[PDB]
Design a protein around this nucleic acid. Sequence first.
RNA 1: UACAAGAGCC
RNA 2: GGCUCUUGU
Length: 772
Amino acid sequence: GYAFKPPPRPDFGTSGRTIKLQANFFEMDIPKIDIYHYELDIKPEKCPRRVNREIVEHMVQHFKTQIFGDRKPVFDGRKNLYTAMPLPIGRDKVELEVTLPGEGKDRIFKVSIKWVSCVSLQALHDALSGRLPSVPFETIQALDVVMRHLPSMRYTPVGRSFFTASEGCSNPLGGGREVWFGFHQSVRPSLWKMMLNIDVSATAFYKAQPVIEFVCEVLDFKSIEEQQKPLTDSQRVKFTKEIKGLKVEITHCGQMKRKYRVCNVLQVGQEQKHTYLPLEVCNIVAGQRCIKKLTDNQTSTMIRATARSAPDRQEEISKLMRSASFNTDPYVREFGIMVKDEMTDVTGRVLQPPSILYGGRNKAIATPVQGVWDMRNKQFHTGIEIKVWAIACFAPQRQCTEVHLKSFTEQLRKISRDAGMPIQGQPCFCKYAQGADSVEPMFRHLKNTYAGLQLVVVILPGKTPVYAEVKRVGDTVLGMATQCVQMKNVQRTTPQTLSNLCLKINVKLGGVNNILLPQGRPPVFQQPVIFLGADVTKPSIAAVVGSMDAHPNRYCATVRVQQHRQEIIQDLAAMVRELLIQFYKSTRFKPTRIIFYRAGVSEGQFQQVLHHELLAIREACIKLEKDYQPGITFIVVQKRHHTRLFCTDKNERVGKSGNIPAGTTVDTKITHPTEFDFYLCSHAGIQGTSRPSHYHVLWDDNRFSSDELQILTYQLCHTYVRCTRSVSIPAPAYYAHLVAFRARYHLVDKDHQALAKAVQVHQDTLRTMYFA
RNA sequence: UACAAGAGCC
RNA sequence: GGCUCUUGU
């Protein structure tokens, strides 16, 4: 039924200079054997995943000769149990009773092992060979979890990651926090091998040491003898918050050991048993995190403990590939899996960054220095005659101050005359309001008093719903376009920092700031073209931005509100109806090429977002004007993945980060062959960072060649408003993120009546922006 | 919310 | 979705 699939890729890329890169991939030889599948029905399910792993280890170490023998399984810690060899258990569902011995009451786990399937590895063989259209994910998770279970004992796995132990090292941080610098282990398909994907993770952990030192260090009370007088109930309530939910165990029973469960306060387990453990006998076994409670400065320095440069990331993943030694891993090499520790050789395509045209008096050309360029006193295309405008500071009055607002305004108009704006005069009204209570009479006063008001400036303290109320009022009620600055960019200013604000408020009303070179433009630009971008984000968010003209700066935005915990677009018809009628109003020309975008989508949701975000635009385009179906170039970006690219022996080291140069498209040998995709990194040296941006283009209507698509997408990265810094993701996707957050705030002041009473967006703002 | 880049947070 | 820091033009 789901025949509305992404098309196969028509042609590989050949443009630009070809580079031989070293990706974040590790070559490995995968055999043709079939991995079997078994299910674990665990009773009870109140125990966590680590307790399940310990009990499965107990029944291999206790019932070796009956279920397994020398053939041994591999384990996914919640339900799944895979094995490369044929286990001697078969169809027989043994409801094995795990008997951990105890003080009278033994810990009884009722687990049943049942054969489910024999997973054919020839399916993934046909997948990476290119003769299958789509790569299966169940078999890629089986190949992932082949290499989990032996490192599951040494590194306690949560999510799809690993949490390393202190291999001869130590780390204190304070407040009961330590960093467990493991790694995000993954495997991704390719052409030749299903090469491994290792990225460092480096998260926090709540250690594996008993609760005496915990009450020594977390409550900062190392001795209770000095605290002779007891405190109030607050330490008891904090004890109830923190101590409950952390598993302890006994060690006062000789060789007989077991693991206990904590649900009451320390009143371990039920109150009807005879095993109660005070603070002097509790021992916490590893595997406990995510129930953390501390201030965020430890989180920030823990983020610093992960923040590593790209050559440092090369050395760290190379050290991890040496020290963990997955070829020396016993059950992995018993499973027929061996890896190649050496970094791969991948063939890529570095791109010439396109020369842009800015208009104005000179109309000369500026070229990017590997994805980055500055205007540097070069006038843009269409400046806008700003005559009357207003300031409505909705921060408290001490923050937005008068002489600093005057110097911000003056340096804004002076750098905007340097960049080519005819800003006429000071703003007429500079009012200093308080908050979300009284937003409406002064907005009515600004609408009725100053006729033809062009822009209103709003100053905000931070994340607060006076912003939410002013955005809802300004884009639904009466209709002035609201641009918002915080004082953190007003108090400290640099010419870049306010030049980019003047070019945000340039396009806020509407105008053209940049145009690509007609010689440098792809042949899509010889026809009219609509650049579209979607975003899914307390009801939830539907928000889509489309452009206005062939000159790629003028856009406009739509907002709707949808039900929560849903990441689909369902009201797309009204959105792109408004976008294409505003295109028709803007240029008197129906655009011929649709360039769709969406930022931040899950990898498994692609067929459903294809189903609801291209059939909806098709039933909208039959509703706008008859015999009008422009070709859609649907590009779905990812921006969060564990797949990196590293420079070839530092041949072209750029920046202090040491990452790869900008535009380095890689489609062969590490990207998925069988579908329509490419990697792209349009970045520079920032913070110490290794990254691409996976532009998995999900639909091309007329099936243009991907050589044109990648250079058009690189240009569209260099058609942002803030194109002064490399924006890495083409412009309507990031506009869509802004307008998505806008729809989010549009409904916070409060079935769907509260939603339906504040969605009637005004006609005086849908021609303008409310997001940049 | 000048904008960007991304480690997780919890 | 959620923030919280670091480095930047």
